């Protein structure tokens, strides 16, 4: 999701 920030999928 480019609309969030987080970890790898």
């Amino acid at each position, epitope marked *: 999701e480019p*609309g969030e*920030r*987080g*970890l*790898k999928g």
Partner: antibody, heavy 120, light 111 residues
Framework: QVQLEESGPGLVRPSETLSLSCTVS?????????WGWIRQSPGKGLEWLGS???????YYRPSLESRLTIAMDPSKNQVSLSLTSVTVADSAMYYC?????????????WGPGIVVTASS | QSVWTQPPSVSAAPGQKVTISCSGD????????VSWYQQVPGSAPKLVIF???QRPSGIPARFSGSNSGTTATLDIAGLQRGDEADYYC???????????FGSGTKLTVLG
């Protein structure tokens, strides 16, 4: 070319609020990129403060979240930072950055930076 | 951790190869894409590696990166004078739910 410029006070009194803003040129903030703030205290390392995207989604440094507000005005090509009750430990170079989010989380480009000194 | 662990100093002669390493608790780095930043005195950080091993336009292929998961690395070969700088790794930390930087490494190109 994509260019970021920081502005705000160079000298603030402790207990006052630090208000910074950043002007983006040659790139719209309506693209799917975050806009954020990093600081670097003299002779020391880098410290991510937080970031925001045009949808309204915001992330903060957990140590500073209660004192931090980071917001975006896409019409004015502006991202901003407000940090309440400034401490002497908040003296640093402050950089504005474009962030590709998702799982990438890379920072490019970086403003040249603005020196903020906190002293009574 | 709040800050990734890098060695403070690494050095080597011009023409040689150096590895700057970056690590967190256990194998935390495996879950994230690491980026690396070059900072010369007087300037802001410049991106030199992103998504573990990708080079942005302008970065030469003698710079390379990897993320084994325990330890991420920035490897710079054929050292030149202009590679002497501070290098910072960076990655998202989902346990803290924050974007974390490393403690920095000065790469001295020996003169």
């Amino acid at each position: 070319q994509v260019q970021l410029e920081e502005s705000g006070p160079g000298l603030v009194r402790p207990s006052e609020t630090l208000s910074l803003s950043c002007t983006v040129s040659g790139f719209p903030m309506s693209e799917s990129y975050f806009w954020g703030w990093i600081r670097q205290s003299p002779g020391k390392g880098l410290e991510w403060l937080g970031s925001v995207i045009h949808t309204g989604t915001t992330y903060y440094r957990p140590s500073l979240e209660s004192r931090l507000t980071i917001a975006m005005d896409p019409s004015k090509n502006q991202v901003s930072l407000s940090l309440t009750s400034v401490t002497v430990a908040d003296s640093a170079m402050y950089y504005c950055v474009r962030i590709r989010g998702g799982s990438s989380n890379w920072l490019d480009p970086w403003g040249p930076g603005i020196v903020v000194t906190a002293s009574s | 951790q709040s800050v990734w662990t890098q060695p403070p100093s690494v050095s080597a002669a011009p023409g040689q190869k150096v590895t700057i390493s970056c690590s967190g608790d256990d194998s935390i780095l495996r879950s994230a894409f690491v980026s690396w930043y070059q900072q010369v005195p007087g300037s802001a950080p410049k991106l030199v590696i992103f998504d573990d091993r990708q080079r942005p336009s302008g970065i030469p292929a003698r710079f390379s990166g990897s993320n084994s998961g325990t330890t991420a690395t920035l490897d710079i070969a054929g050292l030149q004078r202009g590679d002497e700088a501070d290098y910072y790794c960076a990655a998202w930390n989902g346990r803290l739910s924050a974007f974390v930087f490393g403690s920095g490494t000065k790469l001295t190109v020996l003169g």
